[PDB]
Ligand binder design. Sequence first.
Ligand code: SF4
Ligand code: SF4
Lengths: 146, 198
Amino acid sequence: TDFLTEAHLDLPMEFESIGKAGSRLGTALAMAVDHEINMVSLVRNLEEFFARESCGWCTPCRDGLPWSVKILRALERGEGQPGDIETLEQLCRFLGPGKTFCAHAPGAVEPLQSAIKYFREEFEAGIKQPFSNTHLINGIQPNLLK
Amino acid sequence: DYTLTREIVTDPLNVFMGKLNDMVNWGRKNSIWPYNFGLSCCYVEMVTSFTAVHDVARFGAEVLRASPRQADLMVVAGTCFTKMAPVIQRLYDQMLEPKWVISMGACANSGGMYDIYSVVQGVDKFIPVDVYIPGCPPRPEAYMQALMLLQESIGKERRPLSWVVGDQGVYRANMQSERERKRGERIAVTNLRTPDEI
Ligand code: SF4
Ligand code: SF4
C-alpha cells in the first residue's frame, strides 16, 4: 500500500476514503514509520521483498523490480546517478495495473511512488556521482551527447 | 625461374653478350614512356603522380605520349567499361614491342566494386598485365612503387636482341610475390598509432 503522511491520519479507514487519498485500505493493519527511519532504506527493504517474491511469469515485475532494487541500493550507499529517480518513476508508471500479469507488481510499486512523492528529498540525497555507463576505449573517440 | 613466350624454363643467360643485354635492360627500365589514357579516377591519381609534389619525372617516366607507337608502358587506370574495352584492346595492339602493362586500381584489377552489367571484370580478361596495384584509388606513391616493381621486372627479363640474330623468345622472370616477401615485416607489427590523434 502507498505511504501516507501525518495529515492523512484523520480520515476514516474505509475502502473509498483511503482510495481517494491515493492509497489502498488493504488489510487495514497499518504500520507507523518514525523520523529515525530513512525512507530510502525502508523502500529498499520493501522492494527487495517484492523483487524476490516475483513469480517470474511476466517481464515488467520480473525484470523491473530488481532494477529498482539496484537503484535503491545505490541511493542508500550514496552512489546514485542522474536519471535514477526518473527511472524509478517510469518503473512505477509501467508496472501499474494491466501492464503486468497479476496485481503483485502494482502493489510493489505503490510504496515506491508514494515515498518518492512525499519524501523526494531523501531520494535526491543519494545521487552523488555523475552518470557513467561506459568506460573509455583507447583509440575510439566517444560520441559526446549533449 | 622464367616463363617463355613466343612454358616455364630456366635462365638462358658469353660474358660480353650478358653485359650488353644487361645494358639493354637498364636502358629500357630507366626510360619508360607511359601512354596518356584517361579512364576514371585512378587516372587523376596517376597524373597527380606526374605533378610537382611527387615528381615521377625523377624516375624518367614522365614522358606522356598521345601516340601508342611512342609509349612503352600502358597504365590501365580506371574501369573497363564494355564500350571502352575494344578501344583499350586496339590501343594496346597499336603499341610496339617491348610493351608493359600496369593495372591501377581495383576496377582495372578485377572490376572492383562494379560487378555490374556494363563493366568488364578486370582488364586481364583480354590484356596481359605485368603489375597490379590495389587501391581505389591507389595513392600516387603507390603508382611510383608499382613503377619500381616494373623496373625490377624489366631488369630481370631476357628479350631478343635483334630480329635477325639469336633466339626470338621473350623470357619473363617469375619473381617472388610481394606478399610473401613482405610477410616477414608485416606480421611482426604490434602497435599502431591510435586513430584519435593526427
Ligand atoms: S506481476 Fe504477478 S504474474 Fe507478473 S511476474 Fe510478478 S508475481 Fe508473477
Ligand atoms: S578503382 Fe576506384 S578510384 Fe580507381 S577507377 Fe575504379 S572507382 Fe575509380
